[PDB]
Amino acid sequence: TIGMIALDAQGNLSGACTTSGMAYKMHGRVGDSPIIGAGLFVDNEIGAATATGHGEEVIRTVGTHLVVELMNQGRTPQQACKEAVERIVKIVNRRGKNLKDIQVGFIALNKKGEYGAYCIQDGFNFAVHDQKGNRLETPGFALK
């Protein structure tokens, strides 16, 4: 999967999410990537977010809509991604599952061009390009 979100020179947000899905999935299997609350959400009055990972968990938590509503409530993009990850962590536990068996990463942007990310497990990076250049950055993770 790749998810991509941008803020342009006009101050407008947009995003895209595209995937081939889980290798060797059952025919007709769809994950979170084409689902507007889940793999991608954009509200031009607030911010944008995109996700990747185990599709099942992003879907079950409607994750990017959550990240954007958190930004709406006053969280920074980084805080929003973190709190959304922490909700998946609590649900995984409530389900009696093992956190090691799931990976989700969120990235987020607000109107001001602030940005942030958080993920379940180490090993997820994201790329950010602004007028200072293109950088590969490594966000915080829950599973320590």
Partner: protein
């Protein structure tokens, strides 16, 4: 405000961002930037989690999923679509002409001028056949 700016997931977002920046640095629209950026990875047969080169489903069918959202709550989505290399762009066509799946998504794609292509690379076909052996 820090603008323009683009974020993308995973290390292949690094080179995807360079494509997106060709639009953004010239004052172009976010929507066009994110469509060009992810198309670069769709096109890449070496990136086996997106578009062409995608590892197929268990029956050997490369099925793709994508969605797009602009700055005014316009959305388009396709899921489980075969034979079209750039599902983000079909999704954009859905959005401009909100979600199509399976044969119907292909039928719409062909109606908008997209072309049928074999998305299964020799490498992907061979690893899928090796996966079956287990």
């Amino acid at each position: 405000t820090n603008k323009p700016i683009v974020l993308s997931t995973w290390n292949f977002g690094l080179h995807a961002n360079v494509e997106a920046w060709k639009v953004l640095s010239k004052g172009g629209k976010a929507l066009d930037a994110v469509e060009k950026g992810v198309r670069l990875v769709e096109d890449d047969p070496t990136e086996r989690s997106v578009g062409y080169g995608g590892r197929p489903d268990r029956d050997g069918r490369v099925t793709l999923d994508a969605c797009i959202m602009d700055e005014n709550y316009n959305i388009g989505s396709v899921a489980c679509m075969e034979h079209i290399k750039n599902p983000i762009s079909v999704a954009r066509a859905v959005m401009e002409k909100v979600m199509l799946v399976g044969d119907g998504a292909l039928e719409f794609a062909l109606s908008q001028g997209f072309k049928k292509e074999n998305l299964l690379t020799a490498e992907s076909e061979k690893e899928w056949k090796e996966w079956l052996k287990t």
